[PDB]
């Protein structure tokens, strides 16, 4: 179990991650650095050791069953995610802990909010596809429900979320409802209602088929 | 040090798929060697590791009597033969070296190669319009397989620009969306390389 599941800190500040393993055995507990699309890069090796290459503020121990990694100051470079991991010697296998994201503190920001009707093109196709965008929001915690005609919609909206942009460090957020075009073409009010810290009460965006 | 990979591949479910794993720069049977997979949008997710000499394996509950991981020392290669492909082992498959001076952590890992499992065929997206301060993209809709790319503008149009990652749909087919806010012309340039399929959308 890693925890907590995200850090925001800034630049320069501390960064303490926790890991609870199986046994204490020292020996047996690793951690590595993971950034988007590249593959894992060792840290710490049996728990208080650092691997070829890694820098001094990198420093690890293990206090029972508990297992901290701390980044003593954070670098630019720092802002990836982090895995404890266990093995002994039989049975052989590996366990990994479920990674905690070290992300970019920054100021809170609500997010400005669109949303789309299902373009004549695609109804045309067949289907029909209700878009809702939250953009430059922080932080990443947002809640977004789909309404028809005051119908709570569940199960049938897919929402995919950019990383942290590089220039202002937000995020922007993309829901799409997909509705057969039949039942599209049955109701009348399509509302993607947000709710998210930097709004201090819920905002919806809606039209009118 | 190092491990090269390969034998990734885009595969129906129950077809088979061989990985390969080259190592160079320390001598391979010195150490033992393990398969890692990272399912997408999850995290580091051991499979299965080999001896040393070869001679026993072990496996991860979820891919037993399916998997069978094996080396050629002579040729510095491990290998992970995958049969019985299901939709749920697409991940991406990194080979992990034992460490040197502990070998219960993985010091070296390879650059990892992509196994795609899916009962849906190859097939190229279509590019539907989304429409002071205002917001317009393009719908990229029921692609496979992954990945499409995305401009606005032949690339000239970047500020502002937001494009999501794809989305696996129920149909099994993805989905993407790309967005723009502007504050004249706009083009969303798709390339879906596996279907060769380029469409210029202008919203
Ligand atoms: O190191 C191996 C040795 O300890 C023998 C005899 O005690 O036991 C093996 O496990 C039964 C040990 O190897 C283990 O499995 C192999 C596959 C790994 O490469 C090793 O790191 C170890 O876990």
Redesign the interface.
Known sequence: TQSPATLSLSPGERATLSCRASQSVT????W?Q?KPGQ????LI??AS?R??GIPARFSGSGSGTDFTLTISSLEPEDFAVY?C????NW?????????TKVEIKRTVAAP?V?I?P??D??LK?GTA?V?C?L?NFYPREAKVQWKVDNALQSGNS?????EQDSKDSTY?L?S?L?LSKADYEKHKVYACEVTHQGLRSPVTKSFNR | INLVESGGGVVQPGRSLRLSCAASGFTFSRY?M?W?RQAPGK????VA?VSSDGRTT?Y?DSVKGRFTISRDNSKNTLYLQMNSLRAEDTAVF?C?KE?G??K?????????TLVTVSSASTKGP?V????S?A?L?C?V?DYFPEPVTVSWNSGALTSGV??????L?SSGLY???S?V?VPQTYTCNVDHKPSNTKVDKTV
């Open positions: 020996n047996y507990l690793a590595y993971q593959a894992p890069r060792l090796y049996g050791n691997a070829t895995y991991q266990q093995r002994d049975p052989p296998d590996a366990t990994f802990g479920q990674g400005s669109f789309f299902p373009s093109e695609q196709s596809s878009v965008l953009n897919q929402e995919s979320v950019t922007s993309s799409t997909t | 033992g393990h890692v995290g580091l997710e051991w590791v072990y991860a990194y992990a460490g001076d502990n219960f952590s993985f010091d070296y890992w390879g650059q990892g279509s539907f319009p989304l429409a301060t917001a993209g719908l809709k937001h494009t999501f990652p794809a989305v749909q989905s993407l969306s967005v806010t």
